[PDB]
Each structure stands twice: as C-alpha cells, then as structure tokens.
Design a protein around this ligand. Sequence first.
Ligand SMILES: Cc1cc2nc3c(=O)[nH]c(=O)nc-3n(C[C@H](O)[C@H](O)[C@H](O)COP(=O)(O)OP(=O)(O)OC[C@H]3O[C@@H](n4cnc5c(N)ncnc54)[C@H](O)[C@@H]3O)c2cc1C
Ligand code: HEM
Ligand code: HEM
Ligand code: HEM
Ligand code: HEM
Ligand SMILES: C/C(=C\C(=O)O)C(=O)O
Ligand code: NA
Length: 568
Amino acid sequence: ADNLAEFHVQNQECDSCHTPDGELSNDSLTYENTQCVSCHGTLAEVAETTKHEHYNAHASHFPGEVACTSCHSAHEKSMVYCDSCHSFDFNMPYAKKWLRDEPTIAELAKDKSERQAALASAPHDTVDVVVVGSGGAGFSAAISATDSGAKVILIEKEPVIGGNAKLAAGGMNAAWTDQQKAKKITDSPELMFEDTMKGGQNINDPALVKVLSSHSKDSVDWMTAMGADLTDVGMMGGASVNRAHRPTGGAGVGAHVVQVLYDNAVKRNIDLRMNTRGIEVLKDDKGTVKGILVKGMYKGYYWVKADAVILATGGFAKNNERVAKLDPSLKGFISTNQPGAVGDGLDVAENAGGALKDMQYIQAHPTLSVKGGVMVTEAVRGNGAILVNREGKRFVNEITTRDKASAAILAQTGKSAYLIFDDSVRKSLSKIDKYIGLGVAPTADSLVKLGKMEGIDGKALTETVARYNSLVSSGKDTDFERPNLPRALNEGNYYAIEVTPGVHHTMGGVMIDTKAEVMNAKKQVIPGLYGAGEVTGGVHGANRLGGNAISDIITFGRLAGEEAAKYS
Ligand SMILES: Cc1cc2nc3c(=O)[nH]c(=O)nc-3n(C[C@H](O)[C@H](O)[C@H](O)COP(=O)(O)OP(=O)(O)OC[C@H]3O[C@@H](n4cnc5c(N)ncnc54)[C@H](O)[C@@H]3O)c2cc1C
Ligand code: HEM
Ligand code: HEM
Ligand code: HEM
Ligand code: HEM
Ligand SMILES: C/C(=C\C(=O)O)C(=O)O
Ligand code: NA
C-alpha cells in the first residue's frame, strides 16, 4: 500500500475510522483517533510493542495525550514529529522525511476567497475569551479565565500541546517561597527584581519586572495548588541565590508544569482545539476585539465571536531568517526550539494594531549538545559542572549570564567546549540521566581516559579538575570568580558533554502593559487584546535570566486570563 488508509481498507470499511456521514469530527480528529485506539490500544499500550533500549516513538517526554494522527496520517504519507529535533532510527509505516513549510500569515492573504466566505458566515462559536497557544502562558490564561467565570476556547496550531514550555528543564524562578524556606534559602522579590534588571542590562521595563518578581511566589503557590511539585530549588546563571524551582531530584520543570496545566484544563472541561491556527484578530467599528478568524487543518476557516483574545503564541527563535535580520551574529545557528516557534503570533498581533518592542534582543543558550542538537540545561552548571576547552582548561565563570557564556564558548578552539562533571553532580540533577540516555554524555573512570575519548588534553583536564576542586574547598574561584561552588568533581566516574551556543529565546515581541493589555505604537490599549509569555516584549530586556521565562508565562498568562475575564 502507498498509505495507511489503503492498508486498512484491504480488510476494513471506511466507517472503521470514520463517523457515519464521513465528516471529520473536528480539527483535533477526536473521533478518528478514538477509533485507532479502539483497535490498537492507548499510546502507552502501543508503546509496549515499540520499545528500544534508549527511545520509543510512543513513549516520549511530551506531556498530555498525544494523538495518533500527530504522526500517522491516513490518506497520505506522514512525518514523525520527533524528527524535528532528533534522528532516531525509526521505521514508521508510510513515513516521509520531516519538513516543516508552514505558510506565513502574509501568504495566507492568498486565501481571500475562503476567508471572506468564512467571515460572511455565522461565527462557529460564541464565547467570552479565545486563547491562542497551548504553552504555559496559554494554558494558564485559559484556566484563570475559566476560574473567573469566562467561557474559553484554547487553540493550538500544532498537533501536540505545550510549545517550547514542555521542553523547559532548569526551573521556574520565584522568591521568597515556602519551598525556598524549606531548603534554608533566603531570598526576596526585591533581590529577584534587582538580579533581573541587572541581567537584562537595565533595558527591561521595570513595571513589568515588578509584576514578574512580586507575583512569582503566588505563581509557584498557584501551580502547587493545582498539583505541581516545585520543591527542588537550584542555582542558575546571573542569580544571587538559588531560586529556580523544579520537581524533586532535579527533574525537568517544563513537561511537568505543562502536564499539570493540561490535567487542570481537562478537569474544567476547557475546549482545546488542536491543529487550529489563529490567523486574524477581528475588531469592531470602534477598534475593540470582536473575535478571531482561525484555520483548522482539517475543517478549514471559521471564526469565533468573543470579547477578548489572548495571544500566548511564544517566540520566534526557530525562524533563523527572521532572527538573522535582527541579529546577524546568529545567522546559521541551530535552535533549541519546537518547529512551530516562528513568530506567526507576532504577525497576528501587528496586523491587529499591536506594536513590537525589543525585537533585536535575541538570546542564544550557551550549551546545546553538539552531538544531539538539543539544549543541555544550565542546571548542569548550576549544580556544579565546569566548562573546559579542547586544551583541557577552564575559560569562563560557568554561571555568568548567557550572553557572556555564549561568547566565551564561541571564542574557544573549535567554537565549542565541554561540560565536565562527576557522579555527585549527576546524582544531584536527575535531568542529567536524560542526556546520558540520549547518548551525549560519554563517560570514563579517569579524566585522562575521558580526554583521550573526546579530544581534550587529558593531563591538562586532570590538573584542571584538581585545581578547581581545590578552589571549591577553599571557597573562592580566584581563576574566573564564579560566585557559587556547590560541589567538588570527585565522586565516581566523569562525564563530558560537547556544547555550543544555539538560538533559544526572543526577548522582544508585542508591547503590553502591566495588565497584559496589548498597546499600539502610540501606547494606546487595543481593547480586548492581550498578550502573555514569550510573545511579549519588555519583561526580559537585552538578556533573559535562566528560570525567568517559566516564571513569566505562568504569571502573565494567569494575569491575562483574569483581566480578559473581567473585561468580558
Ligand atoms: C528546550 C528549552 C528548554 C527551556 N527551559 C527553560 C527553563 O527551564 N526555564 C525557563 O524559565 N525557560 C525555559 N525555556 C524558555 C521557555 O520554556 C519558553 O520561553 C516558553 O516556552 C515560553 O512559553 P509560552 O507559553 O510563551 O510559549 P510556548 O510554550 O512556546 O507556547 C506557544 C504555543 O503557541 C503556538 N502557536 C503559535 N502561533 C500560533 C497560532 N497562530 N495559532 C495557534 N497556536 C499558535 C505554538 O505552536 C506553541 O505551542 C526553555 C525553552 C526551550 C526551548
Ligand atoms: C474508505 C474507503 C474511506 C473513505 C471513503 C475515506 C474518506 C476520507 C475523506 C474524503 C477524507 C477527507 C475529508 C475532508 O473533509 O478533508 C478523509 C480523511 C481522513 N480519513 Fe478517511 N476514508 C476512508 C478510510 C479511512 C480509514 C480506514 C481511516 C483510518 C485508518 C481513515 C482515517 C482518516 C483520517 C485520520 C483523515 C484525516 C486526514 C488524513 O489523516 O489523511 N479513513 N477520509
Ligand atoms: C487510526 C487512524 C489508526 C492508526 C493511526 C493505525 C495505525 C496502524 C499502523 C501504523 C499499522 C501498521 C500498518 C502496516 O504494517 O503497513 C496498522 C495496522 C493495523 N491496524 Fe490500524 N490504525 C488505525 C485504525 C485502525 C482501526 C480502527 C482498526 C480496527 C478496526 C485497526 C486495525 C489494524 C489491524 C488489524 C492492523 C494489522 C496489524 C495488526 O495489529 O493485526 N487500525 N494500524
Ligand atoms: C496512537 C495511539 C498511535 C497508534 C495507534 C499508533 C500505531 C502504530 C503502529 C501499529 C505501529 C507499528 C508497530 C509495529 O511495528 O508493530 C507504529 C509505529 C510507529 N509509530 Fe505510531 N501510533 C500512534 C501514535 C504515534 C505518534 C504520536 C507518533 C509520533 C510521535 C508515532 C510514530 C511512530 C513511529 C516512529 C513508528 C515506528 C516505530 C519504530 O520503532 O520504528 N506513532 N505506530
Ligand atoms: C517525539 C515524540 C520524541 C521522542 C520519541 C523523543 C525522545 C527523546 C529521548 C529518548 C530523549 C532522551 C531522554 C529521554 O529518554 O527522555 C529525548 C531528549 C530530549 N528531547 Fe526529545 N523526543 C521527541 C521529540 C522532541 C522534540 C520535537 C524536541 C525539540 C523540540 C525534543 C527535545 C528534546 C530535548 C531538549 C531532550 C534533552 C533531555 C531533556 O530535556 O529531557 N524532543 N527525547
Ligand atoms: C533555565 C533555562 C534553560 C535551561 O534549562 O538551561 C531557561 O530559562 O531558558
Ligand atoms: Na519575547
């Protein structure tokens, strides 16, 4: 057979997958996927049959309930979503090579016929608030608006939930939490504010940073109340004290937070629509929001009538063409991002009259795995790892800000460096076991052996770690002035991860005020239009602190949902 449906219909009728009339149920293909599961079992049951030692197409780190049609189309060959970041050895029936080529909002102007017919029709739904994007900000907004009495529709253009938020590793910043106090950490919102402003080169809007710092504990409390574990508190670059909250043992914050938010949305019966892209904010004759035109992948164009639209669409760091026009120094770099993070939400915001700000400030994460492409968390450094160059020497304060760390690594021989750590660091941060599983953390029982394996001078490496451990014992890094020296690298085996910078986060975006209301270039509010999360500008300035994005998206998402509900 040339496709999956052709395979099946050899022994099955059309209505084995389809409704009685043949019509597709909805853009989430809810009915159709229910039929796949009726025969094959749930994703977990299918996973039992597709185990490899270190990976499984049907058992990944993605949170939520991943629809079968995310990867298996019926009447055409289809792509394995995992191939957008990894190259695992897969043999999916009817596969084709991964290629993302999504039309821009501008290109969709060519559907003039189709869009006019939709806008001339009745609204498919009439609700209070539409939230665009199923990352942390969007789920938080949908939940908070729902708890404030609003009827919400939440849309996601991708086949899977969670955006980049589901990938978050190192943690969620907050002060001064019960969780911090339980670990004998002393902090304050004021200190978080000061670190954030300094870290951003004082470009940040201080009113927005005040919301970030002052709301941070409440946001940790809100997540915890919904069932999250934010009890482990680690150090990140550019922080005065440990304030990056994450699950017990140092697991990834993102997949966890997104799973909690998903479960909470499901509990509240929030109307979540996948494969549904927000295209155009609709305004009335006085310039207030009246709804949104969307494009369903399977069902086509339609509009939703609503008082408020919350754009929670994330950043543009995957779009290297757009990135390179704003910061040419990042041209041709790899990205940490999900394949959809291309800035179409900003285009929607600008078309609706929203102004952008701080667009030129784009963060490279200093440590992507050369071997695997993926982000290696800053928490590896925060929990004690060092960086060495090919000459086997330290060359930078490993917990400085990301601008400086990225520059330092790019200045080294080969434009890459190596994270070096031991089993004490490994045992302190369970996320590290994920890199070992990915195959990007080669190991040996001596640094001479590890050095030989990886092309690092083994004698120099050995002496470097001995020297570093001596600085840890004496309490002061006189070589690079690293201010936090949590562990000696002296237990068990040693590990190396080759790392280099990659495009990660876009600090600029739509201009909002402290109530998450979108403003035009004259700083006039667009009534009914809100923005929250990485789609916004002004929170992070010229350089975002590690841990501050998850803080942002929960705080501003929740605020936007409450404000939108009140407005409606
Ligand atoms: C690998 C990785 C690890 C990270 N780790 C951390 C960490 O530990 N701590 C931290 O603070 N930050 C971290 N960050 C940064 C942080 O996770 C991102 O800033 C965060 O994902 C922003 O959340 P968001 O809700 O604004 O957007 P996202 O989570 O990106 O979600 C936006 C969603 O909207 C969608 N969307 C876009 N346009 C449309 C449209 N037109 N219609 C419908 N849907 C649309 C998407 O496809 C996406 O699903 C990390 C980022 C990455 C990539
Ligand atoms: C049986 C011969 C059969 C028919 C007939 C049929 C029709 C059909 C159409 C016309 C569409 C497109 C509808 C639209 O509004 O665009 C469509 C799409 C999907 N189908 Fe189908 N289909 C038949 C068979 C089957 C079988 C056996 C399955 C499940 C294995 C199946 C499933 C799907 C799914 C999923 C879609 C969405 C698009 C896609 O994934 O290709 N169909 N079908
Ligand atoms: C729903 C859209 C759906 C999916 C997805 C799906 C997947 C799937 C694959 C990838 C195969 C292997 C095909 C190949 O080897 O080339 C496969 C095969 C079988 N399926 Fe299936 N399937 C979906 C829908 C359904 C439904 C609704 C049924 C039952 C009515 C069904 C059953 C089967 C059977 C039987 C096979 C052959 C292998 C087996 O498990 O016996 N599928 N399907
Ligand atoms: C949803 C629950 C779902 C079903 C059903 C399904 C079916 C399915 C079958 C039957 C196979 C063949 C297994 C076999 O050889 O016996 C198969 C294989 C792969 N699939 Fe699948 N699949 C479902 C979900 C998904 C999703 C969401 C993805 C992509 C993230 C995906 C992908 C794959 C891949 C890849 C394979 C090949 C696996 C391998 O190890 O080579 N499936 N699926
Ligand atoms: C697609 C559904 C998919 C699969 C399957 C998958 C697997 C996978 C494995 C096996 C690892 C190693 C650690 C583990 O066992 O969980 C791993 C690690 C990372 N992945 Fe992944 N991954 C899938 C999809 C994607 C996509 C599309 C991206 C990029 C947007 C991505 C990213 C990452 C990152 C980052 C890691 C590092 C470890 C971590 O952060 O937990 N994955 N993945
Ligand atoms: C903490 C972060 C990423 C990571 O884990 O290194 C981030 O805030 O982007
Ligand atoms: Na931004």
